[PDB]
Amino acid sequence: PFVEDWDLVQTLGEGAYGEVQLAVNRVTEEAVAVKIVDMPENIKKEICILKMLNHENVIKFYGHRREGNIQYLFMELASGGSLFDRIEPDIGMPEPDAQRFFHQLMAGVVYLHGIGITHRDIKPHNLLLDERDNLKIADYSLATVFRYNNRERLLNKMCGTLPYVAPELLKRREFHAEPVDVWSCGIVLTAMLAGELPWDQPSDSCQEYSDWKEKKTYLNPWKKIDSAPLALLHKILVENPSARITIPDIKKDRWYNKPLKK
Ligand SMILES: O[C@H]1COC[C@H]1N1CC[C@@H](c2cc3nc(Nc4cnn([C@@H]5CC5(F)F)c4Cl)ncc3cc2Cl)[C@H](F)C1
Incomplete structure (x- = not known):
């Protein structure tokens, strides 16, 4: 799978609505995270909150693309995984x-x-x-x-x-x-x-x-x-x-x- 310039390589996790995928730019080799949401008012609200976020301890938002019934939320990639995986x-x-x-x-x-x-x-x-x-x-x-x-x-x-x-x-x-x-x-x-x-x-x-x-x-x-x-x-x-x-x-x-x- 792929989206425009980015290639979907590995699944980073799943939630109540969607799945997050790791995306590598085919041109610049830059890696980011993409939330892949299927199918209304909560997604419009989430995108709004995401654009307001600008802090070093908050996941950075890049933008979103719509391809029919599938949205793509481009977020900062945290290459270190989760804090869950650091708790023995x-x-x-x-x-x-x-x-x-x-x-x-x-x-x-x-x-x-x-x-x-x-x-x-x-x-x-x-x-x-x-x-x-x-x-x-x-x-x-x-x-x-x-x-x-x-x-x-x-x-x-x-x-x-x-x-x-x-x-x-x-x-x-x-x-x-x-x-x-x-x-x-x-x-x-x-x-x-x-x-x-x-x-x-x-x-x-x-x-x-x-x-x-x-x-x-x-x-x-x-x-x-x-x-x-x-x-x-x-x-x-x-x-x-x-x-x-x-x-x-x-x-x-x-x-x-x-x-x-x-
Ligand atoms: O774990 C589930 C259940 O409860 C919460 C939910 N989680 C929420 C965070 C979500 C997420 C995943 C991300 N993962 C990364 N990176 C990540 C995660 N695992 N790994 C690989 C383990 C490793 F480091 F090798 C990486 Cl890289 N970066 C941004 C991300 C943004 C988001 Cl929104 C992730 F997909 C889903």
Whole structure:
């Protein structure tokens, strides 16, 4: 297969709508990523959000081409794969790599939130790495505008991935967008430091969630995590979205600013 100047070489993954393919320019040899969407209002909205994005920790958009019923979303290629593939199951990764990926994830989320966009599905699968190991937030098919004209809009739509969603999505009809993204960055932090997800969903039924709320850090995955990053996780993984830590105050946390090496 091929599109105009680009040759479709290898499948990079699949989602709810589409498949991402690696495309090499036949003339200039330049390699990019292309989302190949089949078949209406969500694709018009996704393209709109994509053109607004311009940050070193956010996947860069190039343009789109329509060929009948198939669209082609040309995005920046992250040659390093995903952050998911860097997390060793039950171990995670070295603390200085987790801290560095976390600083870059915060930079991207501060950026998105500043332009009034919420990603709504932050997870290691959506966090891609470039050749120099730089984190990029990818996949804006669930992304939405939470701030327009300096006016905040509360969300009501259920979306994301259950182990990563904040508890207010399950228990509230309307909720703020920014604390939902912060919660998922805390589950990503946990995954990087323990190589394991704490619960299946942050609901009443979940015993693992109930045990976290009781400050039983003597259980997994919390016992795998050191006292400095675990104190940050205690501030991010708070059930009350209004009591939860904000990104400006995460930037002031002790582990966040702790010099780490190797
Ligand atoms: O994993 C699924 C399920 O949950 C999320 C979804 N994912 C979202 C990201 C999406 C994606 C893939 C990309 N992959 C790359 N590069 C990539 C991925 N794997 N690899 C190869 C593993 C390797 F590095 F060799 C490369 Cl290169 N670059 C841009 C991309 C843009 C996007 Cl939008 C990818 F196709 C689909």
